[model samples]
Target: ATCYCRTGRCATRESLSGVCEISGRLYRACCR
Candidate 1:
């Protein structure tokens, strides 16, 4: 798999691994 955005959103794998982690961030913009 690959990311098309400069700052890709959190994904399944990301969720599994916890990428783009932010504090007090109610949401995350993940892309495929």
Candidate 2:
């Protein structure tokens, strides 16, 4: 599955996996 950090909407079949703090605020991983 492709994984990355996102603050907005995730794509189809994609899901949040982990926490991301590099953007100052906490974000979630977009994985599919």
Candidate 3:
């Protein structure tokens, strides 16, 4: 599943292989 993320918040992922990394004001919905 996809997890909600941003520069702040989002501690973990709903999916083990999911990613929510963010940079500047952009993010990749893939490890946050």
The number of the candidate with the highest TM-score is 2
Question: Residue by residue across 1-32, what tens digits does model 2's lDDT show?
Answer: 67988877666588777767874798777888
RMSD of each: 6.6, 1.5, 5.3
Give the Cα error of residue 5 in candidate 3, in Å.
4.1
Per-residue lDDT of candidate 1, residues 1-32 (tens digit): 45322244454554323234456443454445
Best first by lDDT, ranked = 2, 3, 1
Angstrom error at residue 8, model 1: 15
Q: Please, what is the TM-score per model?
A: 0.21, 0.58, 0.19
Show where candidate 2 strays beyond 4 Å. none
Q: How many angstroms is residue 26 displaced in model 3 relative to the true structure, after the best TM-score fit? A: 0.6
Which pairs of residues collide in candidate 3? 19-30, 19-31, 20-31
Across 1-32, the per-residue lDDT of candidate 3 in tens digits comes to 44455444445553233345445455534233
Candidate 1 vs. true structure, TM-score: 0.21
Off by over 4 Å in 3: 2-24
After TM-score superposition, the amount by which residue 26's alpha carbon in candidate 2 deviates from its true location, in angstroms, is 0.5
**lDDT of candidate model 1 versus the reference:** 0.41
